[PDB]
Amino acid sequence: MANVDEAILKRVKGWAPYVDAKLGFRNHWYPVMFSKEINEGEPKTLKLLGENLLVNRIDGKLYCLKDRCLHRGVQLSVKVECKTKSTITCWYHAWTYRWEDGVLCDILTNPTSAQIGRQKLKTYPVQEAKGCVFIYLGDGDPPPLARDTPPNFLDDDMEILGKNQIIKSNWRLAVENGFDPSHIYIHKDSILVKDNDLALPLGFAPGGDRKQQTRVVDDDVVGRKGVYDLIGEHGVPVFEGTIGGEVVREGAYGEKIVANDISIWLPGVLKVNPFPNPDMMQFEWYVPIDENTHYYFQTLGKPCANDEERKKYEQEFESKWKPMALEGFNNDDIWAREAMVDFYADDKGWVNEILFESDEAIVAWRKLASEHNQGIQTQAHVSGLEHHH
Amino acid sequence: MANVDEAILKRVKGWAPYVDAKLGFRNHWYPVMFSKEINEGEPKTLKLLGENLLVNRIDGKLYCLKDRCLHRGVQLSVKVECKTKSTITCWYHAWTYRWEDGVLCDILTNPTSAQIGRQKLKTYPVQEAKGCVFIYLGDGDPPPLARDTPPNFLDDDMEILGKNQIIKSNWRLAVENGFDPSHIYIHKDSILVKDNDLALPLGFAPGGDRKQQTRVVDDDVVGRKGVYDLIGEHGVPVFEGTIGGEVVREGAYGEKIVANDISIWLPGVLKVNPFPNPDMMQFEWYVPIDENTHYYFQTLGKPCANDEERKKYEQEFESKWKPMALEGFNNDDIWAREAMVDFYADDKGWVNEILFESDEAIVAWRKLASEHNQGIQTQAHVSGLEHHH
Amino acid sequence: MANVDEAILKRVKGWAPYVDAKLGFRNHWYPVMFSKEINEGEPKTLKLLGENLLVNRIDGKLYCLKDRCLHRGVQLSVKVECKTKSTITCWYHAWTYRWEDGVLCDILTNPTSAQIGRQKLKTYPVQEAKGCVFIYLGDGDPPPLARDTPPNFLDDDMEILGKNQIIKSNWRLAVENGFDPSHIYIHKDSILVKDNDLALPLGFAPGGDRKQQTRVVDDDVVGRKGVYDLIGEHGVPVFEGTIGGEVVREGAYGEKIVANDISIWLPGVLKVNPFPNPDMMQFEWYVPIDENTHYYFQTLGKPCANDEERKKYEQEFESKWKPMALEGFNNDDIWAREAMVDFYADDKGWVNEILFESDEAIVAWRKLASEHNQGIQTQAHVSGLEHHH
Numbered sequence A, B, C: 001m002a003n004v005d006e007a008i009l010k011r012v013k014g015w016a017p018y019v020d021a022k023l024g025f026r027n028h029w030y031p032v033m034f035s036k037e038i039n040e041g042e043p044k045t046l047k048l049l050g051e052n053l054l055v056n057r058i059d060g061k062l063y064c065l066k067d068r069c070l071h072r073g074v075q076l077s078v079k080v081e082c083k084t085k086s087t088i089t090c091w092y093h094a095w096t097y098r099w100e101d102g103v104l105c106d107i108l109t110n111p112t113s114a115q116i117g118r119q120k121l122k123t124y125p126v127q128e129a130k131g132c133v134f135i136y137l138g139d140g141d142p143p144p145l146a147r148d149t150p151p152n153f154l155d156d157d158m159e160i161l162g163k164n165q166i167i168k169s170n171w172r173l174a175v176e177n178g179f180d181p182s183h184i185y186i187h188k189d190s191i192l193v194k195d196n197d198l199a200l201p202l203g204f205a206p207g208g209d210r211k212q213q214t215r216v217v218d219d220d221v222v223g224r225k226g227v228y229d230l231i232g233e234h235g236v237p238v239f240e241g242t243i244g245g246e247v248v249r250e251g252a253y254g255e256k257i258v259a260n261d262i263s264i265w266l267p268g269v270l271k272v273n274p275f276p277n278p279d280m281m282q283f284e285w286y287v288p289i290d291e292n293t294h295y296y297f298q299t300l301g302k303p304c305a306n307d308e309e310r311k312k313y314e315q316e317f318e319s320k321w322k323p324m325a326l327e328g329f330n331n332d333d334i335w336a337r338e339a340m341v342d343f344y345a346d347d348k349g350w351v352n353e354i355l356f357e358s359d360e361a362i363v364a365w366r367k368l369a370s371e372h373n374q375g376i377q378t379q380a381h382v383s384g385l386e387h388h389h
């Protein structure tokens, strides 16, 4: 709420909520790390939707606390002091909080303080699934994780493996680039195309009407909200790039057909199937860290019926898929996102851009996101609720 | 237009336009590089008056395009793709533009797009003269280059050689320092003074009336607009610096008389004649890159009637004039400009400064610039014209 | 005056002046360096309360001038030119000022200028005491230095030795941390505690009423204004830190009793006695450099009746006290101050903090500072008085 000039928001009637969501959507689940990255009793710090958070594993279970002492507002993480398995003590004046509910249960510097038991640090639900750590950055009872994940991510036999890193661009530029039908042009020279014998057009010549370009999903049984890119159902793929009629570039004529099923879902996760191989799928999140950065959380899934298959997949992922696809293919997406930063930095790119046909997919997403998000994160949420107002 | 607090502009009645021109004057020709720095088919990027530009040489002729794709606003230069001699293709979605007129002539990702032939990237006139590349950062048909150059710069026999670099100061601080009669004090220890046996006073004791201190030229046949520094016509040069009557510093008593003809011209180019030698002239521009930086475009001219003379001059320029004068003399001007940055950074130096007599020259320039500039560059010009307003 | 959002100042009714004093209090004496750091004829530059200053020693006496030429606002210090013992000449156009009164007495570039003798650079009183250089950053005749120093700092036999450095935090965060009764918890592992066999509790269990927690001194004969921390008179020290009743940390049970007398005084100097040893005292200033930094001026005092005692103290200070206490003990105070920067950066920490009992000392200081400061430094003071208004 109110993150962008009200004059700008008025000019984007329809996508106002999305354009105002510079810090991301509150009240959604977001992956922030892999389960294997956090061990028992070893607290980790991270920033999500602009909020500094602390995560710890106690008796195998994950807990999340706001990394900001209620007293003088310092980050508890400057010098972590976990003196009992169930608590964390601020290094400054020893205000001690329970990981389970955030309650201020003791103050070592004054065990008679009237504040004891009468204050509580903000906590957020945390859930592990498919080896991924999800945090519900929101208030009140959380919805099922399934609502904020793409279809078949949570399938029992679906084996998930991935990589995560911090990228310097607003999360929305990442989402749009990912769901951009014509951006495929930047991947024309990817080592994955050659090395994995992929069929890859340079673009698409749209066919049919506007509504036919996508499929807005707002009737999913588990509550998922997203959009499918159907530009290929009535459109013809472009394999010959011409300038003045002269062919100056050709697409890839490989045998492997992939990415014929592309969808984007709130809070901002893309599903590409099948990819990077006809028997795999890719699920990637663009998680808001702050207005200028996001976690590029990549995962590749492949059905596995037994430990043997999971073991081999893990080996192929490490030796091939990770370096050839997640990096060899998606690395170009990273600098593409970065290249849009300047134009959208002053919030004016949203009104000065000149879109064309294939962008219908992006427009569909901006509308769905505007209408189905569960809340707009604001600086007020970040700085906290005032006292004495 | 509107680059400075309106309260400030009101307090500088008269020089308001000049004080507001933080980004420079639009609709003027500006040198940005030397001809030898750009070869056939090798695009170059640069920022002029805050605008990112692309320049290319095609069939020997120079062309200039706005380095910002109309689609998503990325710089085409992130990954240059010139697929035909007459065009450039954006690396993102392949929108293709003609260098000649900026028209969007093709889109490789969708050759059926309705945008083709219906959009046009901004272009700017470019002209080469005396081995220097000039760009007309303005709209509509450009005036003769002569209007924006000092007298005798374009003389047929005038051989021009120079150096260019980026300096961290607003362009106006550079102009004023260059046209500052008393700033000569900072050059008192220049190696050029000794090594070239120059006569150089520490300052001047003004004589005559105010109007006699300068000569405002606004009746030049080719349209040039500038001011001559005539402080030496009625004033007496100061060769003995005294404090409490005691001589603490003396000027230079060399035989070579130079810089007795000094003039500043819009858009911001200084002419010093003769200098650094009695048979040479210096023409230097202070080109606006953005509000905090400028190109310090230095050139030294010397009449040459034949290839033999031009060849020797080139040799002397490289072995002597460039290192002894352009660098040995003008290097002090660079940190002097930088030293004024802080005081003028908040736009208040324009009203808090305390000028004295010799500054009449600077005041004359601020008035001429305010009255004869061809337009004030604004952030609106930089960010571009909005859509849907 | 007006350094903070008026909405914020209204919410802190009472401490408004203190909260608005981001740049420090004008019209107070502040130490900025040690006498031994500035020699005869060797000018030094520094920034105090946001103002760039120049200090010089002439015939053994210190003088302070504003490091900003009246002409074009450059710092004279870019290239110091002291051509006569009593003056300094700006490197740009040679406007020459007297160190004694700041008067513009000559201009080498124009000895006939009408400005000569009619302009004056700002000067500030400077006084040396106990080997420390104090500057009265204020206007008009200065009060006795004693008014702005803690009791017994100026005692004849009191031998003062110290260290100074620049710290990245607003000065107020430094003052509050220093006068914070419960912050002692951060010093629990200091090498000084063990190596000097100190008795050091983890905190305090307050006793008595609110007014009994401190002693506000506003009736001192020399005008000093400060507050004593009396939390230990009715309170019981905490040596056993418990969580859920379980002892998880203990204080230090050393024999040496110290810091039983703690007081903070305007403009911002703390006195701890006895410390770091039962026969010594510590006086430390948190001097405003700009809104984000301060000088952490530490001094340790010890009575000495003869040169022999002073000589031995100096030796002990260098080999023990300086590295074990000033650094070994106070280094933790440095990062503690830095840890509060973020929460108070937007000026909202003053209203969002949640204090508890021992903070009564800090509240008492914020009230005293608000009521007895001699002026609020503003950006207006820094940028200077306008011309032509």
Ligand code: FES
Pocket (backbone or CB within 6 Å): A069, A070, A071, A072, A073, A074, A090, A091, A092, A093, A094, A095
């Ligand atoms: S800031 Fe955490 S206990 Fe004081």
Ligand code: FES
Pocket (backbone or CB within 6 Å): B069, B070, B071, B072, B073, B074, B090, B091, B092, B093, B094, B095
């Ligand atoms: S941003 Fe250039 S073609 Fe899309």
Ligand code: FES
Pocket (backbone or CB within 6 Å): C069, C070, C071, C072, C073, C074, C090, C091, C092, C093, C094, C095
């Ligand atoms: S700026 Fe100092 S004499 Fe001109």
Ligand SMILES: [Fe+2]
Pocket (backbone or CB within 6 Å): A177, A178, A183, A184, A187, A330, A333
């Ligand atoms: Fe991509």
Ligand SMILES: [Fe+2]
Pocket (backbone or CB within 6 Å): B177, B178, B183, B184, B187, B330, B333
């Ligand atoms: Fe110069």
Ligand SMILES: [Fe+2]
Pocket (backbone or CB within 6 Å): C177, C178, C183, C184, C187, C330, C333
């Ligand atoms: Fe401390």
